[PDB]
Amino acid sequence: PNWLAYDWGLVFLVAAIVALGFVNLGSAAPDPVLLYRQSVALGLGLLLAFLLQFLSRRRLFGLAYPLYGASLLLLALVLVVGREINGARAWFVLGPLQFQPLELAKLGLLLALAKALEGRPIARVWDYALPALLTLPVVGLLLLQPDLGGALVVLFGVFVVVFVRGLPWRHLLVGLFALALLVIGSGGLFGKRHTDFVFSVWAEEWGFVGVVGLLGLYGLLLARLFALALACPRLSDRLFLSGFAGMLGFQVVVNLGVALGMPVTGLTLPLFSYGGSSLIATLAGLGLVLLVHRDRYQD
Numbered sequence: 661p662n663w664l665a666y667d668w669g670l671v672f673l674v675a676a677i678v679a680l681g682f683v684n685l686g687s688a689a690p691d692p693v694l695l696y697r698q699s700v701a702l703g704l705g706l707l708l709a710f711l712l713q714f715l716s717r718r719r720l721f722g723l724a725y726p727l728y729g730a731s732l733l734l735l736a737l738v739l740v741v742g743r744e745i746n747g748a749r750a751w752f753v754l755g756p757l758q759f760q761p762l763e764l765a766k767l768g769l770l771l772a773l774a775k776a777l778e779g780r781p782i783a784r785v786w787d788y789a790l791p792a793l794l795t796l797p798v799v800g801l802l803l804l805q806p807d808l809g810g811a812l813v814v815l816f817g818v819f820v821v822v823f824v825r826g827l828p829w830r831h832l833l834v835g836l837f838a839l840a841l842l843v844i845g846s847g848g849l850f851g852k853r854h855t856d857f858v859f860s861v862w863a864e865e866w867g868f869v870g871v872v873g874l875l876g877l878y879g880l881l882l883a884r885l886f887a888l889a890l891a892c893p894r895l896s897d898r899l900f901l902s903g904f905a906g907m908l909g910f911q912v913v914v915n916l917g918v919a920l921g922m923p924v925t926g927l928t929l930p931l932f933s934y935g936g937s938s939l940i941a942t943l944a945g946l947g948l949v950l951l952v953h954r955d956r957y958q959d
């Protein structure tokens with residue numbers, strides 16, 4: 661953490677998408693008190709992503725299995741002592757504190773699957789079972805809320821990890837598509853409510869150049885993630901980085917089809933749409949990915 665050998669390009673990409681999100685929220689249905697909550701979320705997010713830099717990658721992958729278990733027990737616990745919002749209890753609300761176990765599940769499952777899938781030889785049966793028995797508790801506890809947007813993100817991440825690894829992945833796509841079935845000019849206005857109340861306003865006030873630029877920022881972000889992914893000697897790191905990039909790109913392309921018209925899910929546009937927990941969790945995951953990239957040439 662003392663040396664700062666990071667990929668600063670990815671840092672600039674995250675910062676650029678975040679600054680666009682903030683300058684849009686200030687015109688996309690603004691409110692004096694609704695911009696403060698997300699500003700405090702950004703502060704918390706940067707702070708948490710910095711705190712996680714005092715963590716070696718050895719320790720991070722040592723926590724691969726405990727974090728997975730804790731996300732499983734927290735997914736189970738949110739079903740009992742959660743708060744209903746849109747018909748599903750998926751949030752822990754302790755006054756000003758809002759923590760959804762879906763994010764912890766995503767990171768824990770990515771770490772657990774990456775670590776358990778770096779031994780090249782496996783028995784001819786566990787190529788199906790190991791990702792199955794590690795993903796099914798998470799997806800099942802995500803459907804008991806019910807929240808299938810996070811279930812889709814999780815399952816598609818697992819698909820990406822398995823596919824990049826070199827294991828049976830067709831059954832995962834079958835499960836993914838089956839679960840997914842039960843669901844103003846070139847210039848714009850320039851600043852002149854549903855979940856998409858941050859993106860439906862941006863797409864109209866900034867038009868084709870705005871959407872093209874934002875999708876370009878997301879394309880460059882996914883490109884830099886997959887470039888950092890194949891730039892890691894360890895296989896577990898390759899898997900972890902690629903799973904993260906998959907989940908992120910998948911939320912983005914889910915919001916695309918939502919805007920086209922899908923049904924809608926609770927999945928926000930990462931770093932861009934309104935939501936303090938999603939911002940904080942995306943920043944924390946990006947901090948993890950940044951620290952595993954900085955420790956890529958170490959033991």
Ligand SMILES: CCCCCCCC/C=C/CCCCCCCC(=O)OC[C@H](O)CO
Pocket residue numbers: 675678679682683684685686687690695699850851
């Ligand atoms: C790393 C990136 C950090 C990003 C920066 C941290 C956030 C700070 C936000 C301050 C208020 C800005 C709110 C948005 C600005 C516009 C608000 C406004 O006055 O709306 C009027 C409208 O734009 C007239 O056309």
Ligand SMILES: [Cl-]
Pocket residue numbers: 668669670
């Ligand atoms: Cl660069």
Ligand SMILES: [Cl-]
Pocket residue numbers: 827828829830831
């Ligand atoms: Cl297959």
